Amino acid sequence: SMPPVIKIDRPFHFMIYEETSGMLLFLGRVVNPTLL
Amino acid sequence: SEEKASEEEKAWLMASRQQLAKETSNFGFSLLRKISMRHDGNMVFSPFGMSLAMTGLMLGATGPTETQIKRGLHLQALKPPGLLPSLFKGLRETLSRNLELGLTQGSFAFIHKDFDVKETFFNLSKRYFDTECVPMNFRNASQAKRLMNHYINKETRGKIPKLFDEINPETKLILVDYILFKGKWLTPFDPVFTEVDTFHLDKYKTIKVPMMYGAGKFASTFDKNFRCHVLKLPYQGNATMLVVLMEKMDHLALEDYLTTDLVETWLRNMKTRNMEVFFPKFKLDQKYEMHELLRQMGIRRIFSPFADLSELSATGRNLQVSRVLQRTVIEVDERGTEAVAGILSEITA
């Protein structure tokens, strides 16, 4: 009776996949989103 | 009959393509591991594009030069010929079938004055990567820089305006591969709900960042071993972003345990539920000299005085790769994601 909440409020890893082939197009870590 | 020989072959192609996807992911995770040893902080790169770049080199090498590249990419053998073209044809098809994907890739060969390339390598590069050849004068370094940066700026649509910084005058050939991904979220975030929020840099420090907000059906799971949430943020065209969030501030560094099996385990344990998601906007721009890193992955001889690139050039002997540079830029947004990677390989005399 209270939906889950996921808050990406700390360093995280990301992966962009093309799901048909299964190819990992991009792979990364974000440790601070306010800068390059 | 006629089906028997082709039906067995389709099973084999299907198997081989799964094997290639798996190997490219693991190649990626190996790199992430190597890269992280020198660079703390934000990082981004393209495993797919990096391995296309290297297979471009590989076809061109022979002997220990070639076989070292196959090992580095995790390119293990397959069953029993001459069916490598069919494997690449199959990959293009799969990456072309869905018109909403928003993925384009391409390839350049920048060539030095009168440095004649072997015919079979030229052909293959067009057949496998649609490589475009452009004559060049690397002796006239400042001029070649401007001309090559124009070509990459065009194709990357303004997002990597200056891939090249310095030009080695002894350069005989440089191969650039690029990949462009324009993903739109399957359900975009409504920018009316983007708010400033607290991000935790570490256990003590924090910073304020724009957080995008969505509420609805999302697929996720919780790995109890690594103590992390994994979340799917789907794109149009059958692509997706996996996000892995550790619950505690590094502790068990995921980098060092990350494999195709771990990811497959997560994808198997996903469940879909109504939930609320806060997710920050970000731009990244990263640049990595792969030379020394690839050397650590066992790809040695391509960079040594004894490099054997005799399938790239008939006569030319004193050839070697001097630099492999990779530049990647990503922008995550309320509308989606836009990611560009450019990868260049300096072949020198």
Swiss-Prot record, chain B:
Tissue note: Expressed by the liver and secreted in plasma.
Residue(s) at site: Essential for interaction with PROZ: Y204, D256
Region (Heparin-binding): 81-96
One GO BP: blood coagulation
Listed Basic and acidic residues bias regions: 1-10
Cellular component terms per the entry's GO annotation: endoplasmic reticulum lumen; extracellular exosome; extracellular space
Molecular function as annotated in GO: heparin binding; serine-type endopeptidase inhibitor activity
Glycosylated residues, chain numbering: N123, N140, N238
Keywords for the protein's UniProt record, in alphabetical order: Blood coagulation, Glycoprotein, Hemostasis, Heparin-binding, Phosphoprotein, Protease inhibitor, Secreted, Serine protease inhibitor, Signal
Subcellular location, record wording: Secreted
Modified residues (Phosphoserine): S1
PTM notes: Phosphorylated by FAM20C in the extracellular medium.
Top-rank taxon: Eukaryota
Protein family according to the UniProt entry: Belongs to the serpin family.
Something else known: Heparin acts as an important cofactor, producing 20 to 100-fold accelerations of SERPINA10 reactions with factor Xa and factor XIa.
Quaternary structure annotation from Swiss-Prot or TrEMBL: Interacts with PROZ.
Primary role: Inhibits activity of the coagulation protease factor Xa in the presence of PROZ, calcium and phospholipids. Also inhibits factor XIa in the absence of cofactors.
Protein name: Protein Z-dependent protease inhibitor
Native source organism of the sequence: Homo sapiens (Human)
